[PDB]
Amino acid sequence: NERLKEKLAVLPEQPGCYLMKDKHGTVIYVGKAKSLKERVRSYFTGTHDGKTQRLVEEIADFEYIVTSSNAEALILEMNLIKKHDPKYNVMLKDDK
Amino acid sequence: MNERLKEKLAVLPEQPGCYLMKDKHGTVIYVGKAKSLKERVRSYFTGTHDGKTQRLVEEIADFEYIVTSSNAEALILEMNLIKKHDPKYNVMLKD
Amino acid sequence: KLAVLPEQPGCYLMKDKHGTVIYVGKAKSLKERVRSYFTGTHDGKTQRLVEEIADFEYIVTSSNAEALILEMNLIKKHDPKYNVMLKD
Amino acid sequence: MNERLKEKLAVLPEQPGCYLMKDKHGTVIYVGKAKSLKERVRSYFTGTHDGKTQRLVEEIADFEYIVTSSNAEALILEMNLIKKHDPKYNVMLK
Ligand SMILES: [Cl-]
Ligand SMILES: [Cl-]
Ligand SMILES: [Cl-]
C-alpha cells in the first residue's frame, strides 16, 4: 500500500509503542521500541517465523505513540496491552 | 445540565489527560482519555450520541479532570484510573 | 519527618511499628495531607489507622497524574491493609 | 563468567534504573531497581549472600537495564517489568 509506505517513511528514530491494526481498525499487536522506525519497518521486510508471519499477514495499518525514554515506552506498552488485549500479544508470548 | 456542570465545562483546558464522569451521588461511573480535554468532555453534552452513550450521559451530574503533559501519559493514567475506580460504563460501553 | 515534608504532590506510605506498609495514599500536597492525620478530629476508621501508624515515607512526583499512577503501583506492590478496608 | 560478563559488569552506568537478571536461556528471572545500576548489579557477584539470594546468583548468566529519571518512575517501571516478565525470583524472594 501507498498510504502505508508513506507512514513507514516518516517513522521517527525515537522510543515508544506501536499498535498494529487489521483491515477493520482493531488493534492486533502492541509492541515497545527503542527506535520506532527500525522496529515497525522490520515487520515489512526480511523473514519471520510462522507465528509472526501470520501477524504480518493481518497488518493493514498501524499507529504509534512516542515516549520520552525507554522507561516510559515500557510502562506505556503494558498499559496499552491491558487496554486493547491484542490477539497476537497472547499468541506470540510463550516460547516456540 | 445544572449550573455547576456548565461552570466546569467552561474551564476545561486544551490539554491531554483523563476525565472522570460522576453520579449525582459523586461516584465515578466512567473514565476516559483525551488528547484535548476541552473538545472531548464537552462532546458528551452536545450533539447526537449512540443509545448506550446516551445512558451514560443521562447519568452524569459532575466530572473531574486530570491534565497530563503528553498523550502517552494520558493513556497510562487512564488504565490506572480504571483500575482504581472500576467504573460501570467502562464495562458496559465495551465493544 | 513531619517538619521536612514538602508542598509537592506525591505518595505517602504509612507504616506499622513492625515496619509494614499499612496504608498508601496520594497527596496533591504531601505536607498538608500527611500532617492532617495527626491534627484536628477524625472519623473512627481513620482514627484506628492513626493509632497504628508508627512511621512513614513519601515519594514526590512532578504531577497529580504521576501521583495517581504511582499510587496504584504502590498499592499493587504493598497491598496495604487499610486500603482494602477504608474503601471510599 | 569469563571476559564478557566482566566487561559487561565494567560498563554498567552510574545511573538509577531497573535491572533484569537473565538465565542461560535468556529468560528474565529477577527484576529489581537501584539508585546506582553499577553498584546494585555488581553486588550480586561480590561478597556474601543469604540462601535465597545465592540460588538466584547461581542462575544469572546475563543482565539488561533500563535507566530511569525519578524515584516515582523507577517504582512504576519495576512493577510494569514484573507484570511483563513474571520473574520466578520476584515470586520466591517476595
Ligand atoms: Cl502503570
Ligand atoms: Cl555507583
Ligand atoms: Cl522488557
PDB file of C-alpha atoms in Angstrom, chain A residues 32 34 68-72 74-79 93, chain D residues 64-69 73 76-77 80-81 83-85:
ATOM      1  CA  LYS A  32       7.652  -1.405  22.539  1.00  0.00           C
ATOM      2  CA  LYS A  34      13.893   1.705  21.308  1.00  0.00           C
ATOM      3  CA  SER A  68      10.414  10.417  26.313  1.00  0.00           C
ATOM      4  CA  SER A  69      12.527   7.368  27.122  1.00  0.00           C
ATOM      5  CA  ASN A  70      12.774   3.614  27.008  1.00  0.00           C
ATOM      6  CA  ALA A  71      11.433   3.533  30.590  1.00  0.00           C
ATOM      7  CA  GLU A  72       8.244   5.335  29.534  1.00  0.00           C
ATOM      8  CA  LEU A  74       7.892   0.060  28.715  1.00  0.00           C
ATOM      9  CA  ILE A  75       5.213   1.484  31.036  1.00  0.00           C
ATOM     10  CA  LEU A  76       3.087   2.597  28.067  1.00  0.00           C
ATOM     11  CA  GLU A  77       3.496  -0.815  26.471  1.00  0.00           C
ATOM     12  CA  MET A  78       1.988  -2.703  29.405  1.00  0.00           C
ATOM     13  CA  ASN A  79      -0.864  -0.189  29.743  1.00  0.00           C
ATOM     14  CA  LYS A  93       4.012 -14.563  24.200  1.00  0.00           C
TER      15      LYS A  93
ATOM     16  CA  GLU D  64      19.829  -5.915  30.973  1.00  0.00           C
ATOM     17  CA  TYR D  65      18.953  -2.495  32.392  1.00  0.00           C
ATOM     18  CA  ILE D  66      16.613   0.424  31.790  1.00  0.00           C
ATOM     19  CA  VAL D  67      17.612   3.835  33.147  1.00  0.00           C
ATOM     20  CA  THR D  68      15.057   5.934  34.995  1.00  0.00           C
ATOM     21  CA  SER D  69      14.867   9.700  35.822  1.00  0.00           C
ATOM     22  CA  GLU D  73       9.388   6.289  37.502  1.00  0.00           C
ATOM     23  CA  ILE D  76       6.380   2.310  38.256  1.00  0.00           C
ATOM     24  CA  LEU D  77       8.809   0.727  35.791  1.00  0.00           C
ATOM     25  CA  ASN D  80       5.462  -2.985  34.970  1.00  0.00           C
ATOM     26  CA  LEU D  81       8.546  -5.136  34.312  1.00  0.00           C
ATOM     27  CA  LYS D  83       3.994  -7.865  35.287  1.00  0.00           C
ATOM     28  CA  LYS D  84       5.618  -8.223  31.856  1.00  0.00           C
ATOM     29  CA  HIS D  85       8.060 -10.967  32.821  1.00  0.00           C
TER      30      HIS D  85
END
